[PDB]
Design a protein around this ligand. Structure first.
Ligand code: NAP
Ligand code: FOL
Ligand code: MN
Ligand code: MN
Ligand code: MN
Ligand code: MN
Length: 159
C-alpha cells in the first residue's frame, strides 16, 4: 500500500524556495510517528531540503542522476522506488510536489495536515478529486505556545 503524507498551508502551498517557512512541532511529531519504521520515498529537492537521512526509516531518493551519498538508496524511476521498498505493508511518500503528483494515482491513503497559515509559496500539493476520498480521521487543534497556527490532522482513504 502506498500512502502520501504532507502538510498544506492555505491554497495547498507546501513550500517556498525549497524550504518550509513555518514551524509546527506538533506536526513534525505527527510526521515522525506515522513514518517511523517504514520506507520513505522523496524527490531529490526534498532530500536537499531535509539535509540528512531520516533515522529509523529506509530513505529512498528519486533522481535521474547518480547518487552522491551511500547512506540512502537512490532510484531512477517510480517503479524502481516501489521495488526497493520490498514487501512492506505501507510505503510513505514524503514529497515534494513533483513526486506527490506521480504517486497520487497509486495511493490508497493520504495523511494531510491542514495549517491555517497564508504562505507565499512556489510548490503546491496536487489537486485531488474530493469524491474519490473518504475522511476516516480528523482532529483539530488550536494554536498554542509551541504551535503558532491552528492545524487539522486528517487521514483520507481512497473509496
Ligand atoms: N509541506 C510538505 O509536506 C512538504 C513535503 C515535501 C516537500 N516539501 C517542499 O516541496 C518542495 C520540493 O518539491 P519539488 O516539486 O520542487 O521537488 P521534489 O518532488 O522533491 O523533487 C523533484 C526531483 O526529484 C527527482 N524525480 C522526481 N520524479 C522522478 C522520477 N520519476 N524519476 C527520476 N527522478 C525523479 C528529480 O530529480 P533530478 O533533477 O535529480 O532528476 C526531480 O527534479 C520544497 O519546498 C520542500 O520544502 C513540502
Ligand atoms: N505532515 C508533514 N509535515 C511536514 O512538515 C512534512 N515535511 C516533509 C518534508 N520536510 C521535512 C523536513 C524535516 C524533517 C525532519 O527532520 N523530521 C524529523 C523530525 C524531528 C525534528 O527535526 O524535530 C524526523 O525524524 O522525522 C522531515 C521532513 C514531508 N512530509 C511532511 N509531512
Ligand atoms: Mn521503467
Ligand atoms: Mn514483492
Ligand atoms: Mn488543506
Ligand atoms: Mn494562522
Amino acid at each position: 500500500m502506498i500512502s502520501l503524507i504532507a502538510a498544506l498551508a492555505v491554497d495547498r502551498v507546501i513550500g517556498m524556495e525549497n524550504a518550509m517557512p513555518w514551524n509546527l512541532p506538533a506536526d513534525l511529531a505527527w510526521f515522525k510517528r506515522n513514518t517511523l519504521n517504514k520506507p520513505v520515498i522523496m524527490g531529490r529537492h526534498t532530500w536537499e531540503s531535509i539535509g540528512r537521512p531520516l533515522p529509523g526509516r529506509k530513505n529512498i531518493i528519486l533522481s535521474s542522476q547518480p547518487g552522491t551519498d551511500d547512506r540512502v538508496t537512490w532510484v531512477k524511476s517510480v517503479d524502481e522506488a516501489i521495488a526497493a521498498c520490498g514487501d512492506v505493508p505501507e510505503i510513505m511518500v514524503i514529497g515534494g510536489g513533483r513526486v506527490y503528483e506521480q504517486f497520487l494515482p497509486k495511493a490508497q491513503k493520504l495523511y494531510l495536515t491542514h495549517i491555517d497559515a497564508e504562505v507565499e509559496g512556489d510548490t503546491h500539493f496536487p489537486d485531488y478529486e474530493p469524491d474519490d476520498w473518504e475522511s476516516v480521521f480528523s482532529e483539530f487543534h488550536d494554536a498554542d505556545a509551541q504551535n503558532s497556527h491552528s492545524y487539522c490532522f486528517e487521514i483520507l482513504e481512497r473509496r
